[PDB]
Design a protein around this ligand. Structure first.
Ligand SMILES: *[C@@H]1O[C@H](CO)[C@@H](O[C@@H]2O[C@H](CO)[C@@H](O[C@@H]3O[C@H](CO[C@H]4O[C@H](CO)[C@@H](O)[C@H](O)[C@@H]4O)[C@@H](O)[C@H](O)[C@@H]3O)[C@H](O)[C@H]2NC(C)=O)[C@H](O)[C@H]1NC(C)=O
Ligand SMILES: *[C@@H]1O[C@H](CO)[C@@H](O[C@@H]2O[C@H](CO)[C@@H](O[C@@H]3O[C@H](CO)[C@@H](O)[C@H](O)[C@@H]3O)[C@H](O)[C@H]2NC(C)=O)[C@H](O)[C@H]1NC(C)=O
Ligand SMILES: *[C@@H]1O[C@H](CO)[C@@H](O[C@@H]2O[C@H](CO)[C@@H](O[C@@H]3O[C@H](CO)[C@@H](O)[C@H](O)[C@@H]3O)[C@H](O)[C@H]2NC(C)=O)[C@H](O)[C@H]1NC(C)=O
Lengths: 124, 462, 124, 51, 52
């Protein structure tokens, strides 16, 4: 089904087999600079998202669930609603306003999950 | 005790670097057509982000002359400004047998431009027809060293092939940032007590710099940044006279120039589908072009500068003297503003004496005390070597005023020894590398290698 | 602290906030070859260093351990001096003499750390 | 007609103006959308969407 | 300038009209050329003339 093989579906209906999307983010060949800006576009686009995902310790594209509790005021709707009643479009449009904060929280709170789990393990 | 080698990433470590760079100019590089302003294909809208930040106990040697932004700035200025007159008419028809006459104030204290004619190949290549247009007096060479006092030719076409600077391209000095690529970082100092080399005290870092001014001149320094409250002298080796001193002031002295003639354009169609411009029939009475400077403040600024050169020359008296010989391209103050080129001799700024006694002009009896600079003016230009030298600027219509400020001076010492008390101080033909190093010295670009090693007592499973 | 703000302070204070020094490696526009020749810096600098970190088994841009021991001849100072008092600058300037040995040992010793994982994991 | 405006140039016979068709395709990362419904007067939503 | 009883392939001296650094101050010029680098203009009696 390619690039947009599950658009419009609920979250659970497309929370697996994401490989068919992430596996293809590079393309094209020679027309000088005006095209070659689309070849190194992968660095501008793919690697940025990759390092955002990897800085949190969520390297490896699973459903990575790490630290921060979900504050109720952000959506305030039940688990079933967000999980299987909503779709990605308006969910992104509603929550995209707060992701820059969430990534900062995820990366700044990451150091406390690894600061002492190397040498206390040595004692163990 | 037992410990193991442990690896850290994101380590704040750097090395001095050389690298290819960016540019950034503010919103004023985008509104107008293609091929003007000269950053409109290239420069990114700047932001001062990330913000300028202080460092701790950092100690690095900011060598002024061991840098590549000055090299870079020259190669970029030259290589963009050399190709940037390619999309224009490029002459060859006019390299002809002009014919002249007399309109000459036979004994005037004036350096007027000449009227001659020429046979013009009209747009159709086999209907030739005559035409005329004025020409500034240096630009034309007589065809012959004989009694051929009629026959005259342009100074080009024996050396190269030139270009009429298209009017769409303005030469005006728009302020430019240069910037370094991501993964390289730039450093800066805030202190004013710099001397050229050595470890700086109040080190700082910026993503990239402030707004530079690319102007072009030889003796003095116009439009650009400034120091704050003390005069500072920067140079490599005071032992030798062969090298340039660069003089920054705490206050600038106030300069203005004008061309009172009211020039007008006289347009001809030459060659198929392209048009030549020339100075037309000059309206009004002929007057002489010039510059204007305030006598009281320039003398006071001389009085304030002398104490800086007596930091290292207490055994000899300061005196100023004329530019040390040479031709049109080095003896004069030669810069630009307003679409035309002036050539002005600054001997009436550089003779005097400071011998310790500072006697102020205050309270001022004549605030209008000025000393003037008489000028010639050109259209044909050889702006550099290895830049596609030969160019022609079409003349601007009307009359102009270019009030500006002396940001700094470039000077040069004259010799003396064996019971000599009369060393002196003269202009300098600072190259463009000796123009812009006044405005690029603050910054050094460094290369990060954030992979590092440190001790740790980890024993994660084997 | 941005790109270099964490510099100057000691490794005691620079053992954290590592991510801000490595989170940004992209911004700006297009100017042909002459400016595109900075964009491929990511290949020369970022991806190479990440491969360095990977073949040491240290995936994840944070602190990571190794199995290779210390040596007194390299540094010779007390723990507290290096660990809390000095900064990264002179530490890099001094220990860079022996980085070849560290790289070679961490390179070849990984074979001893992945030798027979087929049988050590088969019966679990 | 010219010889007062700008220069002209004769296209060599090899450069024929055969309007030989052209597809398009966005770059990777980006995508193309489309919808088949046939009541779209320049604005408004659509149902039978495709890529 | 040929040595008819010779055996050597010597070059051909010729003269022509050339522009100068004033485009309407023409004067002639001379310089020699290797013979396989010049071809004759016509098969007519006007042979002495030639061209690159
Ligand atoms: C190849 O062909 C060329 C022509 O296409 C030949 O050039 C010609 O050479 C002859 C022989 O030298 C010249 O004719 C002579 O001109 C002199 C003038 O000299 C006098 O005046 C000068 C003034 O400065 C002075 O310096 C001298 O001392 C003399 O006082 C006459 O005096 C001679 O009698 C004779 O007329 C031609 O002028 C010249 N033609 C051109 C167009 O220059 C060339 O020699 C040929 N080369 C070979 C190897 O065959
Ligand atoms: C620069 O020099 C040229 C000549 O070398 C000047 O152009 C010529 O100027 C004369 C004198 O004005 C013109 O002659 C006059 O023509 C009128 C025709 O109505 C006649 O009534 C007068 O008695 C007189 O003969 C002449 O036509 C003109 N040349 C052409 C081709 O028009 C030119 O004016 C000079 N420029 C300056 C600024 O002095
Ligand atoms: C072309 O020439 C004319 C006449 O020379 C210029 O007009 C004159 O310009 C000067 C400034 O250069 C004006 O000076 C006045 O100065 C006083 C300061 O005492 C100030 O308060 C006034 O606001 C004014 O600026 C002068 O009034 C003005 N007119 C005359 C009759 O002199 C003209 O500016 C020149 N063109 C350019 C582009 O400068």
């Amino acid at each position: 089904l390619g690039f947009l093989g599950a658009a419009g579906s609920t979250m659970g209906a497309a929370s697996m087999t994401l490989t068919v999307q992430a596996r293809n983010l590079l393309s094209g060949t020679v027309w000088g600079i005006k095209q070659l800006q689309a070849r190194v576009l992968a660095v501008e686009r793919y690697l940025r998202d990759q390092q955002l995902l990897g800085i949190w310790g969520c390297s490896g594209k699973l459903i990575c669930c790490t630290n921060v509790p979900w504050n109720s005021s952000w959506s305030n709707r039940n688990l079933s609603e967000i999980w299987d009643n909503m779709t990605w479009l308006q969910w992104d449009k509603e929550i995209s306003n707060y992701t820059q904060i969430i990534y900062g929280l995820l990366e700044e709170s990451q150091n406390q999950q690894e600061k002492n789990e190397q040498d206390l393990l040595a004692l163990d | 005790e037992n410990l193991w080698v442990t690896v850290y990433y994101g380590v704040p470590v750097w090395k001095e670097a050389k690298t290819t760079l960016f540019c950034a100019s503010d919103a004023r590089a985008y509104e107008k057509e293609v091929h003007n302003v000269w950053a409109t294909h290239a420069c990114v809208p700047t932001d001062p982000s990330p913000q300028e930040l202080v460092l701790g106990n950092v100690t690095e040697n900011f060598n002024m002359w061991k840098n590549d932004m000055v090299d870079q700035m020259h190669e970029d200025i030259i290589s963009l400004w050399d190709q940037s007159l390619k999309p224009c008419v490029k002459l060859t028809p006019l390299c002809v047998t002009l014919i002249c006459s007399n309109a000459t104030v036979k004994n005037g204290t004036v350096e007027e431009m000449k009227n001659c004619s020429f046979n013009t190949t009209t747009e159709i290549r086999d209907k030739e027809k005559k035409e005329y247009a004025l020409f500034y007096k240096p630009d034309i060479v007589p065809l012959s060293e004989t009694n051929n006092t009629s026959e005259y030719r342009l100074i080009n076409c024996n050396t190269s092939a030139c270009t009429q600077a298209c009017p769409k391209v303005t030469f005006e000095p728009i302020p430019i940032h240069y910037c370094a690529p991501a993964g390289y970082a730039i450093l800066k100092c805030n202190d004013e007590t710099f001397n050229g080399t050595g470890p700086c005290s109040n080190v700082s870092t910026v993503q990239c710099t402030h707004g530079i001014r690319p102007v072009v001149s030889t003796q003095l320094l116009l439009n650009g940044s400034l120091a704050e409250k003390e005069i500072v002298i920067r140079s490599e080796n005071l032992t030798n006279n062969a090298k340039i001193i660069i003089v920054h002031l705490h206050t600038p002295v106030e300069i203005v120039c004008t061309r009172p003639n009211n020039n007008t354009r006289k347009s001809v169609r030459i060659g198929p589908g392209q048009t030549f411009y020339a100075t037309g029939d000059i309206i009004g009475d002929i007057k002489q072009a010039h510059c204007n400077i305030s006598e009281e403040k320039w003398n006071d600024t001389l009085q304030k500068v002398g104490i800086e050169l007596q930091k290292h020359f207490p055994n000899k008296t300061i005196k100023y003297n004329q530019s040390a010989g040479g031709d049109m391209e080095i003896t004069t103050h030669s810069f630009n503003c307003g679409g035309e080129f002036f050539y002005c001799n600054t001997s009436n700024l550089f003779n005097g004496t400071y011998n310790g006694t500072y006697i102020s002009t205050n309270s001022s009896a004549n605030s209008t005390s000025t000393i003037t600079l008489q000028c010639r003016i050109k259209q044909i230009i050889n702006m550099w070597q290895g830049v596609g030298r030969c160019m022609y600027a079409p003349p601007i219509a009307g009359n102009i005023t270019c009030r500006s400020n002396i940001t700094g001076l470039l000077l040069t010492r004259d010799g003396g020894t064996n019971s000599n008390e009369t060393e002196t101080f003269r202009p300098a033909g600072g190259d463009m590398r000796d123009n812009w190093r006044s405005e690029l010295y603050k910054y050094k670009v460094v290369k990060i290698e954030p992979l590092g090693v440190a001790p740790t007592r980890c024993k994660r499973r084997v």
